[PDB]
Every structure is written in C-alpha cells, then in structure tokens.
Design a protein around this ligand. Structure first.
Ligand SMILES: [Mn+2]
Ligand SMILES: [Mn+2]
Ligand SMILES: [Mn+2]
Ligand SMILES: [Mn+2]
Lengths: 136, 133
DNA sequence: TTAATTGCAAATCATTTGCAATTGC
DNA sequence: GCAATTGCAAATGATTTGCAATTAA
C-alpha cells in the first residue's frame, strides 16, 4: 500500500495526503508518458476526492523533487514520467500512442563532437524521433 | 518582392499590405523571432497591422511550409523562413542565442534507429544545449 | 464582383493563484 | 494547535475565433 514514489516523499520528509498517495500510486504504476489531464483521469479512477489543481501542484512538486522528469514533446500539454536511472531519447509513433524509448551511444558521441567543434561544452540535449510503422 | 512574397503569389494566396510587410520581415530575419517580436518588427515598418493578423499570418505561412516553428524551451513559439537545407539547433544556455548545424552521420543514424524499431522516420527534433568554452 | 482578410474583442487552453476551509504529523 | 494542503473559481499568458466592415483580385 506504500508505493515506490510514496516512499520517496517519506524520505524527503514531505507530508503524505490521501491525494498525494494515489497520484504517487498511479504514477508509480504508469509505464508510458501521461499528461496532467491523463493523471487526473487515473487519479480519480482510484479516488474522487482529488482536485484538478492538486494534480498540477503535485506533478510540479514531484518534478521539483526530481521524482518526475518533464517533457514538452510539442503537442501543447506537459507529459510526465518517473525520473529514469539512465538516459534515453524518444521515438513517438505518429500513428498511435506508443512512445518508444531508445539509446544510441554513437549519436551521443556525435552530439559531443558537434559541441566541441563549435567551441561548446554540451550541457544537455533534446532528441525526439517521429515514426510511422513501416510499409515495406 | 521578397522571397516569401514570391511564394504567396505562386501559391495563389492574396497578398495584403500587412502580409507584404510580415513577409518582408521574415525574409530579412536570420534569427528566430517570436510572434510579439515579429509584430513589433511589423508594427514598425507599417503601424497599421493587428497582432491577430500576425498570429494568423504566421499560422498560414507555417501550414504552407513557408516558415518553420520552434519551441526552444521558453514557452513561446519561434519562427524562421524555411531553410533550403535541413538543420538542427545548438542553443547557448548563457545568452539564449542559437547556432544552426547539420550532421549527415546523425541523420543517417536517426533513420537506422527508427528502422531498428519497425518504423520509418517522418520527422525529428534535435536541440543541443551548451556553454561556450 | 465577391470571397478572403482584417481589427477588435471576447473565447479557448493549459496552467497558476488567492483564499477560505481542511487535514496530516 | 498549526502549518501545510486542498478545492473551488477566478486570474492568467499565449494563441484563436466570431462578426462586421474592408479589400485584394
Ligand atoms: Mn540522447
Ligand atoms: Mn521516457
Ligand atoms: Mn536534424
Ligand atoms: Mn534555424
């Protein structure tokens, strides 16, 4: 009953409300990259005594505590995921909701070279691929 | 006529006074202005231009792939004339200024990752964030 | 000639905020 | 007890849209 993310709060000394418990639960069990509205929908599908604004506040708090990473894929709304322990980029299926995580060391290395050739130290990056399923 | 204006005449689009100016601006820019910034540039060359016209015009231009749009991480759409050759962006985190690069090796590798997963690449987005040495 | 565009304001959209009430530790 | 948190509801800030008058073509 004490979920992955719920524990992270306890260790950081954050007060654990009913609402924060279920948001933590929902986000703990989520495999994909939901937006704030999607979190609301799953949060209430577990307990209705939760307001739209506290999803927003909680999602923000979690982000501030490095419990969540935020992505602005372009589609207007902010989407969230539990902060991974290893870096990855994103492959968005333009034909469904499938989001595919991937790594490419060759790319990461090429990114570093480009910064260096340009007299920059690379301090971060955003990579997103957009795909359709192959048609031979 | 500007390059952009040439494109509207050829596309069949009505050229208005305001469109003539908004198109003059974005043909001349070599940076990545936001809508307010494009409005001020336009309001200057001819003050008889609404903000909504700017918003409408920039929407139109993008849909006609006359312009390209970007969200460089400042919660605000930025725009440029569609370049001849595709390029990605490196952003100076100290000044928010922007450098444009290309890299066939990355483009080739991107396609290969997509294929590796049962996909064909149809668009991508690559930004680099850096501090100057 | 006549349908597209403009200017204005009000309306969306996602997100935040003031405040009175509510609740965990 | 009390300080922290919640829930409306009513501000946002950026972008759009409805309508009447205007204008390119
Ligand atoms: Mn990467
Ligand atoms: Mn991910
Ligand atoms: Mn590229
Ligand atoms: Mn550019």
């Amino acid at each position: 009953m004490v979920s992955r993310i719920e524990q992270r709060l306890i260790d950081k000394g954050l007060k654990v409300t009913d609402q924060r418990r279920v948001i933590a639960q929902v986000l703990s069990d989520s495999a994909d990259h939901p937006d704030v509205e999607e979190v609301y929908r799953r949060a209430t599908a577990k307990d209705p005594r939760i307001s739209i604004a506290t999803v927003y506040r909680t999602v923000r708090l979690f982000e501030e505590e490095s419990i969540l990473e935020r992505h602005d894929f372009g589609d207007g709304r902010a989407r969230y995921e539990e902060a991974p322990s290893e870096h990855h980029d994103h492959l968005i299926d333009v034909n469904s909701a499938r989001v595919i995580e991937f790594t490419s060391p060759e790319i990461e290395a090429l990114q570093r070279e480009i910064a260096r050739k340009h007299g920059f130290r690379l301090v971060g990056h955003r990579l997103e691929l957009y795909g359709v399923p192959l048609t031979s």
